[PDB]
Ligand binder design. Structure first.
Ligand code: G0I
Length: 104
């Protein structure tokens, strides 16, 4: 639906340009971070979400919401809350939750 998807484009653009987005703009490189592929079974990032959105592959807003929440779930799984990626992820998670709620 047009209303459901256009809002997703707004929120995704805002998340990409957010100051705290730096840990999530491209996929994590498992060659570079010890243990990532063992622990995070479904990686996800904003650029993957952007590819899928432009491709047309999101049917409803809820699927979009699932990939978005997946970014921050994986973040909290792998990083401690006081790590730098951790802290950034909490800012990005609170931003997403609040913004999603002032649409739906
Ligand atoms: C700690 C690694 C990590 C990043 C991370 C660290 S640094 C970075 C961007 N880099 C800086 C610019 N040059 C190139 C890449 N992403 N993100 C996530 C979601 C991570 C984990 C383990 O979950």
């Amino acid at each position: 639906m047009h209303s459901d998807l256009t809002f997703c484009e707004i929120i995704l653009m805002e998340m990409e340009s957010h100051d705290a987005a730096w840990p999530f703009l491209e996929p994590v490189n498992p060659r570079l971070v010890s243990g990532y592929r063992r622990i995070i079974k479904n990686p996800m990032d904003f650029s993957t979400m952007r590819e899928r959105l432009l491709r047309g592959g999101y049917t409803s807003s809820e699927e979009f919401a699932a990939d978005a929440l997946l970014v921050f779930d994986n973040c909290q799984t792998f990083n401690e809350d006081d790590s730098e990626v951790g802290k950034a992820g909490h800012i990005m998670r609170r931003f997403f939750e609040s913004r999603w709620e002032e649409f739906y």
